[PDB]
Amino acid sequence: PGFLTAFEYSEKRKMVFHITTGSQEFDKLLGGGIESMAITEAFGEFRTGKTQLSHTLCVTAQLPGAGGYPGGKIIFIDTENTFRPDRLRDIADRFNVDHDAVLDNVLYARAYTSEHQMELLDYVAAKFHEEAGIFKLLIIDSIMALFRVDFSGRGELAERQQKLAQMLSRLQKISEEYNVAVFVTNQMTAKKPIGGHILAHASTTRISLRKGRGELRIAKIYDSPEMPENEATFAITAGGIGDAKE
Amino acid sequence: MPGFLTAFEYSEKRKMVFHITTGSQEFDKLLGGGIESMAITEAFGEFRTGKTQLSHTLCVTAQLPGAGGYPGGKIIFIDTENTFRPDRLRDIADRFNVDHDAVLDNVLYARAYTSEHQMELLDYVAAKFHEEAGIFKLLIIDSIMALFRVDFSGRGELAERQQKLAQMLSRLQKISEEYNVAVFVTNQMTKKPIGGHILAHASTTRISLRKGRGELRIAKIYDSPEMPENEATFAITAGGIGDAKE
Amino acid sequence: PGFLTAFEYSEKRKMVFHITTGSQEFDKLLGGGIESMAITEAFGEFRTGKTQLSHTLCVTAQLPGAGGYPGGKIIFIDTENTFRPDRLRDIADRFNVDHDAVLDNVLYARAYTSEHQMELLDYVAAKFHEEAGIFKLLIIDSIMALFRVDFSGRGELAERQQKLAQMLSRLQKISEEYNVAVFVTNQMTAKKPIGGHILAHASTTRISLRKGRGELRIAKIYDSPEMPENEATFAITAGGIGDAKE
Amino acid sequence: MPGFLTAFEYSEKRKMVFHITTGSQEFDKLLGGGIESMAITEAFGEFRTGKTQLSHTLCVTAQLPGAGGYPGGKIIFIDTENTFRPDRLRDIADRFNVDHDAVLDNVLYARAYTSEHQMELLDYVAAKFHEEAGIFKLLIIDSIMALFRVDFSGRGELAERQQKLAQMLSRLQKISEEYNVAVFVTNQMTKKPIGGHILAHASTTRISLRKGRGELRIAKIYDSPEMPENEATFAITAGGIGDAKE
Amino acid sequence: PGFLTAFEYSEKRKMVFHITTGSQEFDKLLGGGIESMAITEAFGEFRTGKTQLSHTLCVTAQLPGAGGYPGGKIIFIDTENTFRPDRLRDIADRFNVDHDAVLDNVLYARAYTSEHQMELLDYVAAKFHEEAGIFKLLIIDSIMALFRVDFSGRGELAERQQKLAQMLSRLQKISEEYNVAVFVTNQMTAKKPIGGHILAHASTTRISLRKGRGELRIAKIYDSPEMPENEATFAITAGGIGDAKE
Amino acid sequence: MPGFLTAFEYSEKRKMVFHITTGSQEFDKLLGGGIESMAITEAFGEFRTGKTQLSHTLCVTAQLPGAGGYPGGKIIFIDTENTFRPDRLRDIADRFNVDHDAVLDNVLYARAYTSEHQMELLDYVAAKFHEEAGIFKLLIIDSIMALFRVDFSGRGELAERQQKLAQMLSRLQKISEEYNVAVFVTNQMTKKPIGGHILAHASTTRISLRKGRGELRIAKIYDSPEMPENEATFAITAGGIGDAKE
Amino acid sequence: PGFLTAFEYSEKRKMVFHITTGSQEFDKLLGGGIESMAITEAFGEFRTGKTQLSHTLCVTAQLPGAGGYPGGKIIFIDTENTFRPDRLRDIADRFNVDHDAVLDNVLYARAYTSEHQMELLDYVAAKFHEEAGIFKLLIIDSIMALFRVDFSGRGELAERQQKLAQMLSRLQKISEEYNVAVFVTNQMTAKKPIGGHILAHASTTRISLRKGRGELRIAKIYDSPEMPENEATFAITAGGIGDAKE
Amino acid sequence: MPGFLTAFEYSEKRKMVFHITTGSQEFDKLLGGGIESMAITEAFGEFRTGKTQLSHTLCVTAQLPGAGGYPGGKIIFIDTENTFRPDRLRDIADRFNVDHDAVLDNVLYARAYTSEHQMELLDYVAAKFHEEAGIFKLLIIDSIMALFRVDFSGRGELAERQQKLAQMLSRLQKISEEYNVAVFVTNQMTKKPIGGHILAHASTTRISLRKGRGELRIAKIYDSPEMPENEATFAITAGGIGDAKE
């Protein structure tokens, strides 16, 4: 009655996969990469790597990977007007895969309001149902910019939080029922990530991105102790997220 | 009387109270034998303090014959954090020299995505325990009110949050005491544990977990005087909660 | 018309009795012990003697005592999940009375909500009516923990105070109409006892319990001048509330 | 006129005003003879300042022929504090050399458990005085508004508290002045007496009681200049309120 | 149309009279005494002369006086329970007039609520109409103690001010239509007189009373410059308000 | 146009504007001739600054032929302060060598007891002026908004106070400008004059009155720079407002 | 569809004209004078030149001027009761034009309420329609004094701002549809001009007027950098706004 | 999918994105070529920083064939500030050696007088673009939300202001992206730009304009680090926005 045995749940989790970020150290930080049946959130300031990571995953999710990962299709929801297919050209070149094939395997939609964003996710649930195992990654860049927009006054916050919680619980269910990785970007405020308890709870992994030495970037697990193991160095290139020169 | 028992009848009922070993002798002594039936035991602390290791360890130890005539039984696990991992149970089962698949078959598992969902799940749990009493010995809720923080984050709805929270916890008390099961729940901090008077009253035993020297952990009775007897040292391994190797 | 002569009231008060606490000095502090036709409130921190006193009275109320007190039955309402018949075994042993007889003379009920607690007290009024003089003591441990639980927000206090006042006025009437002692425990807050004017007015005697030297305890009349006569020393043993070594 | 008397008619009415001795000559001088009829006299102070001794002493002295042609009469005692004790009246009766049972037969007594109950009782008192005027000489309310504090403790209902309180006190004034009885009431402090403008206006005389040297007490006119004539020393004994033995 | 010529109004004002206070200097301060077609307000602390002045005017208003004043009857409204016909005996003795005659010419009523006080004033308007020129003085001791009583919370002030303004405008109309002096007493608060703008506007003359040397008193025009002409010394005796020894 | 005049038609209307001498040459120079028609002139100040003397003096000077072809006329006086005294007009008439009864016949007088009454009176004034234009030259309101302070003293009704006040003052402006009468009003201070923007806008000229050296007074244009031309010295005598005898 | 080509709009703007202020430097500051198809706002303290400028424009708007300006008629809305045709006599004399002709070309109306002011502007729109090109200037002295009057409390501001915005948008439309200059005066507050964003946006040019040396005045563009080019010196004479002696 | 495109289809759509030169090479480099289509570009700054010169310059440059295959097209200009001046376009057209009347015929222009009017105008714009796509290339809104400040200036209506503002800006985004037009808007500051999160999110590029040395101006990417590449120097001439002559 709404319950599985731990054995049945184990059978379900044996299908969990990781999508490489393109950086070895970053993957190790994540235990292999962006994990399915979970929401992974990346937040930071501008030029920390959020967009490069989103675009890189658009390519790596289509590639055969570790643990028998066969690759698959991607859904990209864009609230920021930042998706640029041309970036995928350089990234696909790096990974030696055809441009048009990469572009044919990414489905894309702009969201202009928070209500629209929620409608899109209902469409996404239907598409994942059409045939499971085809799509492996859902990207939302970004997760709640539109919720700040649509409920900006300090009197409408109750409805904002309710709508946000509803969307995120549906996003959790989507990730876990259909065995897809959900990657989302988020903004910061006076810094801390926005969304409060709701977004903190919904995300299974939260990554703070900041600038490193020169052109290097640093990824860290948010609210984790200040220790090196909880941090990873990566570089940004025309080929996407990658490893430092070394 | 209507709704009253004699102290003798109640004594007969309490003679069947049991404890489930935590895997640590010192922790068990602190608890008077382990996680106690006809009661709610709450464990709270920061990240990597032992909450998840204790939850998973209890999934195995609740199935083993133990002290005080404890015969072992089945477990129900409600997961609000997306943290349950059967593979941890395999390592802990190895430690206790018991079959993996048998351990996994004896744990019923459900994710909760909203506070309303969590309460519905607990109504199903009452039905399951009732189907045949004495089969299930442990109900785990990891965690008890993260979803109430989520669903009632803006103030002005706090009254309804407190009412729903109190209602769930009074039902939990009645479940633990009517069906003689131990209820183990985890909780977050904000440091002091969240939940205020409601959760403080509902729990019969409250445990703060914190990091000790090196890889050791420390369990303490919350709101108790600063004295050694109210504290216990334990260790965390791939085999679960255990004793320090001194 | 709702009035008695002072003579008739005197005839009524001539039946007032005291139930020994088990401690001579404590009894002297109370004028003989826990007094009938009145509410006596004991508050303090943990391990001050509240539970030991409740359990001790479960036995002493059944014993013949000073002033021709013949002993009688007890009703115990438990909001804290702290009643333990096993404690009564040691206390009965101390007073050389049979265990099963002691347990048969105590009626017991858990209250899980404040509304439930009030319903229980309405049942209690009916039971006392069935035959007066059978029951001599009503214990409520504790008096208003559940009222803090059920009305925790700062907007529901009006209804909380009204419900609390209603319960306590009925408790006063129960104690005085049926000539029973009412003993209740209470918590403290930033320390002072909770309940404010309502509980202060309802209780005829209020006792602060605190830790003394070593294992000794101290009982005092709350809000009374700082003088020795208003204080008493007692000890806690397996046999319940008792006198210090001396 | 309609509702008006000539000063002569009012003079004839006031010629029947009487005083009830407090048992203390100095206290009586302070009051102009004792507790005055056609008026409310309020006594307030801390614990063990004399309020209860004065209430009980008046239960006896109101029955004795006295100065100014006072013939003695019966007493009504409304008890909100659970403090009335006929046995005190026996000791005070002994002092004044009068029979116990006669003293007790001449005092009518009722407990009030709510403010609404207290007001209902006062309506019955008006009826009783009316049954045959000149029989009752004293109405005691110990205490006047503890129950109003209880029944309206949260703010927001303060308006209704003040309205009910004012209504009761205007009725009390009319009772004292229409039926030529002295009204004596006790009150708490919070230091200044509670009740604000309403109780200040309703009472014709207000007395603060405080502790003097050793076992002596001091009565003072409230809000009066710091001068000796506005103060009186009295003593408390088993025989009630009396004069200091200097 | 609701207007008189200044000539007709002059004819009306030619009938204005003064009632001596009993003190020569006090009368000079007032231009002859208490003036008709006007409200005169006296405020101060206790034992400043308010009651002595009220009682003195009860006698002097009946005496032939300066400017052809023939004397007349008085109406006394008592909100404070302070009117004492016996004081008039000594005052009448001073002025060598019969006691019973003085008492027969004063009509008296207690007011127990502010609504009652307003009803009484409506009765007074009717009585003055029965035959003008019979009554010369209306005393209200005090003017708004009952309005503070009936509207004590800070939420009912709107209705309080409206009722107070309505009463005072009717009082102005009574004084000016029927050519009677209206004398009222008032309390002070943190000192300043209570009533604010409403009472300040309604009163044509306002008098502050304070204690002078020894048993002397001082009357001053409130809010007037600090100069001797705006002040007068008077004495209080068994014969009422009078002149200093000198 | 509908509701518009040519500047020529308006010029013809303004050619009939007149001034009423204050009795003081220097005051008149300050005002450009005296109290001006088709305008409201407001005078405010403390007690005994000249407001009442000016009001009464104008009652006489408005009846005298004067400078600029002023022919004299009748006066309407609305009295909210109970300060109008025809006998003052007799002394002022003596100064100007005119008959008393003629002066008194030419002043129409009414008391206002409420703000609603004051507004009703002004509607009657509009009717009277209309009965035959050119008869009345001066409308005095002493004072303009004391009764609005009275009738709306508690906040929360301030909106209605401001609306009623604005409505009365716009009617006053229209009365002054439609019927070519001077409107003179007195006002209180709280220092700055009360009435805020509403009264500031409605008045065309505002005069502050204050005490000068010895028995002299000073009139000044409110809110004007500190310069001598904006000030005038005048004297007060039994004959009214006059010039200083230097 | 509600749009013009830039060419058609150019044809419309080619008819834009300027009305000289009477001061050469002031005109240069304005680019020729008061500009049509726009609102020009002048604010300042008293005696800064607002009224002199209004009256001067009443004459100069009728005079042939630079750029082929033929002169025309004027509408003057007066909320302050300050328009004086006699001033125009001296100004017309300066410009050598007949008095009666100047006065016949100015239409005039007083506004007594803000609603009235808005009704007047609706009449004005109709008059401008009767035949375009006849009227060249609309003066409003002042623009929103009556809006402060009619909405003075801090609770009615929403409706005030809405009404003010509505009037000003209609005023913009009037100026631009009928090719007329709109000149308005405004007050200042704690200094800054009143009206906030609404009036700031509606006005195309805003002029601060202040006192200069001796009798000279200074006009500046409000909120512009502190530089000489943004300022102009002018003089005030019986002939209106003019150039300094030099 | 329903509402989704493949990345390839979206790539084909973005291949038609164009840039409109600002007239300044350095400014263009800062913008990646100029004002970009399928996006909103916002420029804000103080007075005389270049906002109006840029708006007018774009009216001409949008009509010229340019880099990246830009063919030129028509412009829609919505004017909330009353600042559009075709004569400026004549000077700028001269600089670029193009006919005046042709330039003016290719700009459609409308004033907005209210925020509701502004939104209605944008609905007409959507219709016009749709009449035949590819004709219009640029929509200018000068300025974007001055009228929203005006129409919702009092707080309490801020919720509705934010909702209307968000709705307009989401429509603007959809207009820019559906019909492949560049949207250029100006904005005020209060220093930081007004509009909060809503306007920050809606604009894809935000430019702060400030004054440089002498007559130079500086354009910067808002909220970007203090670095030279994020800034550009340009000059303002009668010919519009141009490069500095160094």
Author numbering:
A (entry chain B), C (entry chain B), E (entry chain B), G (entry chain B): 83 to 272, 285 to 340
B (entry chain A), D (entry chain A), F (entry chain A), H (entry chain A): 82 to 271, 285 to 340
Quote the authors verbatim.
BRCA2 is essential for DNA repair by homologous recombination in mitosis and meiosis. It interacts with recombinases RAD51 and DMC1 to facilitate the formation of nucleoprotein filaments on resected DNA ends that catalyse recombination-mediated repair. BRCA2’s BRC repeats bind and disrupt RAD51 and DMC1 filaments, whereas its PhePP motifs bind recombinases and stabilise their nucleoprotein filaments. Whilst Ex14 and Ex27 share an eponymous FxPP motif, their sequences are otherwise divergent, and they demonstrate specificity for DMC1- and RAD51-binding, respectively.
